[PDB]
Swiss-Prot record, chain B:
Organism this protein belongs to: Severe acute respiratory syndrome coronavirus (SARS-CoV)
The encoding gene: S
Protein name from the UniProt record: Spike protein S1
Role played: Attaches the virion to the cell membrane by interacting with host receptor, initiating the infection. Binding to human ACE2 and CLEC4M/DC-SIGNR receptors and internalization of the virus into the endosomes of the host cell induces conformational changes in the S glycoprotein. Proteolysis by cathepsin CTSL may unmask the fusion peptide of S2 and activate membrane fusion within endosomes.
Source species taxonomy: Viruses, Riboviria, Orthornavirae, Pisuviricota, Pisoniviricetes
Origin superkingdom: Viruses
Glycosylation positions in this chain: 12
First-to-last residue of the parent protein present: 18 to 63 of 1255
Length: 43, 46
């Protein structure tokens, strides 16, 4: 299904292909229009 | 109507050197301020 987006709260999220627990918050990382998600200096 | 041509010359196959071209984005991952080793299909330098 599809739910609302809970921010600034530890939630168990499931985006299209990405799962895990964490805290969601907006950001200013300039994705290119063909970049679905990002990664850290680790993996 | 598929039409051939009358006097097509044979191709020349002349040689040139590709210095630093053919580099592309191998995936759809945003990465910032980092070096990253890929193993993929690339046009090799020179």
């Amino acid at each position: 299904l599809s739910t609302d987006l809970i921010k600034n709260q530890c939630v168990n999220f499931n985006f299209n292909g990405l799962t895990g627990t964490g805290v969601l918050t907006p950001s200013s990382k300039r994705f290119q229009p063909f970049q679905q998600f990002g990664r850290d200096v680790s993996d | 109507r598929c039409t051939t041509f009358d006097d097509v010359q044979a191709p020349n196959y002349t040689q040139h050197t590709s210095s630093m071209r053919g580099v592309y984005y191998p995936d759809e991952i945003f990465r910032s301020d980092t070096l990253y080793l890929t193993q993929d299909l690339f046009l090799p330098f020179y």
